[PDB]
Each structure stands twice: as structure tokens, then as C-alpha cells.
Design a protein around this nucleic acid. Structure first.
Ligand SMILES: [Mn+2]
Ligand SMILES: [Mn+2]
Length: 537
DNA sequence: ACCAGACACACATTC
DNA sequence: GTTGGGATTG
DNA sequence: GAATGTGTGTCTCAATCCCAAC
């Protein structure tokens, strides 16, 4: 309805920062917000376009908007302020990004030009010839169009990182929200600001991101570790990311064959499952000695239910290749292992979708829900428990879930609420509770509540067949490890309404063999005498 | 939940 | 001349 | 064939487009 939707939403961000994050701003950055308001309606619009767009540099032909008048006119106030820069200095690398493949051939006609292979390969070709950067006028002085470079991107991304609690979300969040595509729970403005404590937390987040940026963009390890720290962080979720960065770094040291580094690195990170990869890295360096000594420290005090699974695998192999005795390990009994061989030639329909078709009977129906039913059914019961605001949970409106979810204190900071809601599960009114929370909070962008899947018909069936104790067992387990137990469950779930009873079943072809996350789920089920099975084809 | 978990799929190797 | 991935769009 | 690793492919609103693709 409003052509300047992107401008109004951009104003809404700077307005939010002026209100709440006033003291967290700097002298020259306050001047930016003030000066921005003093730009024409057209020049405010033209600026924000170049931000939302991916690139930093912009060919004038690509900045053709109708909301804004003449692009060459509305840009002038930005060129005056220096926020935009005409006649910018750019490299051969980012010159390719602006020009088409055809135009590049004309310019480099008699300067080593062959029948091109690939654009990224052409860049690799003109690296040593034109290493130094120049202005556009210095590459093709004859070139007609002007190119605008955005000088205030660093400033912009700071305001974005402050509005949100991260950088992964972009300005599209406003559009997708206003259009009703993403509907969020209007959590109350309780913790007015846990965006950040001081600027120190921002620069930390920002410089870590720069290393990540300089990693995908190929740069050697010795360069990226020079700026990194050996000392951990104080801010909880910030320390978690630095750690998570070291993890993704160690992966590359193992993807390529340099296990000495990967191994030494995995131990410096307190990331989930990093301890394991340190052992598997030693294993793959003929370091069985220190692989076992470390594996012992894990055996004496594991990291999670998943870690325990890894040790059972690794220990016999290390103990074996060492002089030690091969300590025995455990295995799972294939519960209700049903099999069926149906042969057909053509139709490429989904495998899991086809099994749903076969189990269909006049007495029982089956739904294709891999970790979907129990997740949503949990996220509704403990809905109000999750979206309750702690002093450092929520801050901006467009948030999917409470920020302290991956933190181990997620259950502790809500230990009261979760126990109040879960009380209903063994007590009465677990059906009346879910229903009210189903109708009231429908369609919202909640974690582990897949609305688009859970239909009104399915829900009522599950509530009857799925018993109190089994729901009482499942949900409690998710709370032990939320990031860990969110995945790995039976593809299908069947219900027998008459003599109320259900049964979950994972379906596999011979080409598959189930995963570690699913295996851990089948164990938990057989232990509690939960009707479950595996189906082969 | 920061180009990711989250399913199958495809290779290798070993008691 | 093809076709399809990805920045762009609201 | 069992059970092991590890390495790929797929995909997040949907309709538009243009530029570089084997
Ligand atoms: Mn599945
Ligand atoms: Mn399956």
C-alpha cells in the first residue's frame, strides 16, 4: 500500500536505536542518524536501497527505481555527504562483479583474452597481469555509466546487529512480517534491552564475523589466527560463537589432511561434539596413545547422550590398536523389525509417501511425521513457558525463539514454568491446554511447532492414542538436551482409535541404514515399552 | 539459531 | 542461440 | 552382507528476471 515501505521500516530501526540504544552509540554515528533525516524523501530512499541490496558497489543502470526520481539527481546529497562515492577505486576482482561477461571481453581484447572458460576462472587468469586496483576511468576510460560505492556499509550493519541480536536476519524480516508470511508472538516489551551490554560486545561480535568472512573468502590459517584470541569470552552467547567458529575452522583442518592442527584446535573449543572430533582426529593421526588417554577423560564424564554413543565406537578401536584389552560394548535389539518387498518400475513418488499409502486401512491411519508430531505437541504444551520473557530472552519483535535456547540455562531460567505446564501432562487437562494454545497461537513462527504440518484432524487423534506417560517421558527428554533431541525420530506414526494405541515406524530401503540420532530414539522407546518399530524394503 | 541442521543418497574400510 | 541460479522484488 | 566411518545432494515466502552459464 505504501511505496516507501522499505524506507519507513528503515526509519523504524533507527528510531528503535535512538530510543533504546542511545548510550551505545558513538559521536559520528549519532550524526549519521540525524543527517539521514535531513536528506530528501528520494535520497533517503535511494540510500537504503543500496544497503538492502547485497553488493557494495552499484552500476547506475541497476539502480532504476520509480519511487525515486532521477537516480543521478537523488544520489547527489549522498555524494556530498561522502556516504556514497563516485569514481571509486576497485580491483579487477570486484570489477568483474559489475560488468557482464561480454563487456569484459571487449576491454581485455588484446590484453590476454581467450575463449573464456568460466568467470571465476577468468579472474584467476587476470590475477598477475592487473594485480593493482584502479578507478573505472583507469580500466575503461571510455566507459559511459558511473559506478557508486557505498562507504557507510560498516555503519549500517552495526545498526542492524543492534536491532536484532545477530546478523543472519536482514531487512526483509519487516516485509515478510507486514505481508503476514511470518507472524510472530507479540512477546511483551519486558526486558527492554538485552541487545548488548556495552559497545565492547558489538565490536567482539563484529570482528569474529570478519574472521568468518575472511575464511570462506580463502585466506590461510596463519593469517586468521593472528587476530583471534587464546583467552575465552565473558559474555555467554558470545563465547559460544567464538567456540563455534573454532569448530568450523577445525573442520577444514580435517577436510584437508592436516589432523595435527584440527586435533589441537578441537580441544580449545567447548562446542558440542568437539571433544569427540578431537579423538577421531587423533585416531586419524596414528596417535592412539593420547587418543585413549583423552577418550578416558570422556568415558569418565561424557558430554551428552550422543557423546556416549561415540565412545562405544571409538574405545574398542583404540583399546584394540593399543596394548590394552578390548572392552566390550553394547548393541540395540531390532524392535518389531517388520519387512516388506514391493516391486514396481516407473513411478518416482516419495518412498515414505508410498508406505503411508500401504499402511492405510479402514481401522487405522498413518501420518508422515519425522520428529514433527512430538515437537509441535511439545511446543504447544510448553508454549507459554518458552515465550515468557526473562531479563535476557527477547528484545526485538521479529524473533523466532528465546535467545537463551542453546545455553544450558534454558531449563534452569524457566525451571518454574516448565514444571507448571508439564504438571498438566500427568495431571488432567493436557488436552484442554493444547487445544486453547493451538487455536490462540496458530500460525506463529515458533521453534519446534510446525503448524503447516499439524492439521486439526491429526491433533485430536494423537491426544487419544498417545498416552500421558509416554508424552510425559518424551517432553522431559527434550528438556535434557533441546538442540540434541530435536531431530531423529520415526518417519511415520499410526493410530488405532478403537482400542486406543499407536506405533511409530521409520521406513528405510536397503540403500539406507538409520542414523545415530534415530538409533538413540529407538533405544529410549524400547526402554519405556513404547510401541515402536522399524520397517525395511 | 548465525551456509545450516535434517532427511535420504553416494562412496570407502573392516572385524 | 539456449537454460536455469540467484540477486531482486514486494 | 553387517557395521563402520566420511562425503555428496536436497532445502527454507513466491514470482520475477539476466546474466553467465556444460
Ligand atoms: Mn525421514
Ligand atoms: Mn526413512
Amino acid at each position: 500500500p505504501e511505496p516507501f515501505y522499505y524506507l519507513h521500516n528503515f526509519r523504524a530501526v533507527l528510531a528503535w536505536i535512538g530510543e533504546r540504544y542511545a548510550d551505545l552509540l558513538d559521536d559520528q554515528e549519532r550524526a549519521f542518524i540525524a543527517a539521514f533525516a535531513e536528506l530528501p524523501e528520494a535520497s533517503q530512499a535511494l540510500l537504503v536501497r543500496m544497503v538492502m541490496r547485497k553488493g557494495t558497489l552499484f552500476r547506475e543502470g541497476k539502480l532504476a527505481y520509480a519511487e525515486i526520481g532521477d537516480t543521478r539527481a537523488a544520489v547527489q546529497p549522498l555524494l556530498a555527504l561522502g556516504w556514497v562515492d563516485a569514481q571509486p577505486t576497485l580491483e579487477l576482482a570486484q570489477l568483474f562483479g559489475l560488468l557482464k561477461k561480454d563487456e569484459l571481453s571487449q576491454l581485455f581484447r588484446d590484453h590476454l583474452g581467450r575463449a573464456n572458460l568460466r568467470k571465476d576462472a577468468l579472474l584467476e587468469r587476470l590475477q598477475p597481469l592487473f594485480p593493482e586496483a584502479r578507478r573505472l576511468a583507469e580500466w575503461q576510460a571510455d566507459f559511459a555509466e558511473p559506478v557508486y560505492e557505498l562507504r557507510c556499509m560498516a555503519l549500517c550493519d552495526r545498526l542492524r546487529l543492534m536491532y536484532f541480536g545477530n546478523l543472519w536476519q536482514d531487512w526483509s524480516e519487516f516485509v515478510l512480517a507486514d505481508l503476514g508470511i511470518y507472524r510472530y508472538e507479540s512477546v511483551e516489551f519486558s526486558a527492554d534491552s538485552r541487545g548488548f551490554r556495552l559497545r565492547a560486545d558489538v565490536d567482539a561480535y563484529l570482528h569474529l564475523f570478519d574472521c568468518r568472512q575472511r575464511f570462506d573468502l580463502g585466506e590461510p590459517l596463519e593469517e586468521l589466527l593472528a587476530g583471534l584470541p587464546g583467552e575465552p569470552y565473558a559474555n555467554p552467547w558470545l563465547e559460544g560463537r567464538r567456540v563455534k567458529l573454532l569448530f568450523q575452522f577445525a573442520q577444514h583442518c580435517e577436510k584437508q589432511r592436516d589432523f595435527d592442527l584440527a586435533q589441537r584446535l578441537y580441544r580449545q573449543s567447548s562446542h558440542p561434539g568437539a571433544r569427540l572430533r578431537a579423538i577421531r582426529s587423533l585416531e586419524r593421526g596414528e596417535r592412539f596413545a593420547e587418543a585413549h588417554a583423552l577418550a578416558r577423560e570422556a568415558s569418565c564424564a561424557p558430554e551428552s547422550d550422543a557423546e556416549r554413543q561415540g565412545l562405544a565406537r571409538l574405545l574398542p578401536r583404540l583399546q584394540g590398536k593399543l596394548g590394552l584389552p578390548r572392552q566390550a560394548r553394547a548393541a540395540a535389539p531390532e524392535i518389531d523389525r517388520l519387512d516388506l518387498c514391493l516391486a514396481f518400475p516407473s513411478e518416482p513418488c516419495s518412498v515414505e509417501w508410498a508406505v503411508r499409502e500401504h499402511l492405510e486401512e479402514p481401522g487405522c491411519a498413518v501420518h508422515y511425521v519425522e520428529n514433527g508430531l512430538i515437537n509441535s505437541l511439545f511446543g504447544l504444551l510448553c508454549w507459554e513457558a518458552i515465550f515468557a520473557a526473562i531479563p535476557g530472552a527477547f528484545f526485538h519483535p521479529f524473533h523466532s525463539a528465546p535467545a537463551d535456547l542453546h545455553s544450558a540455562d534454558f531449563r534452569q531460567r524457566r525451571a518454574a514454568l516448565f514444571e507448571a505446564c508439564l504438571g498438566r501432562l500427568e495431571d488432567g487437562s493436557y488436552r484442554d491446554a493444547i487445544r486453547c494454545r493451538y487455536r490462540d497461537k496458530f500460525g506463529l513462527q515458533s521453534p519446534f511447532v510446525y503448524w503447516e504440518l499439524l492439521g486439526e484432524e491429526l491433533l485430536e487423534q494423537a491426544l487419544d492414542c498417545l498416552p500421558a506417560a509416554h508424552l510425559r517421558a518424551w517432553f522431559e527428554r527434550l528438556l535434557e538436551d533441546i538442540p540434541g533431541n530435536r531431530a531423529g525420530l520415526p518417519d511415520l506414526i499410526q493410530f488405532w482409535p478403537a482400542q486406543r494405541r499407536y506405533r511409530m515406524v521409520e521406513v528405510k530401503g536397503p540403500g539406507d541404514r538409520l542414523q545415530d540420532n534415530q538409533l538413540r530414539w529407538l533405544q529410549f522407546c524400547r526402554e519405556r515399552e513404547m510401541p515402536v518399530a522399524v520397517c525395511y524394503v
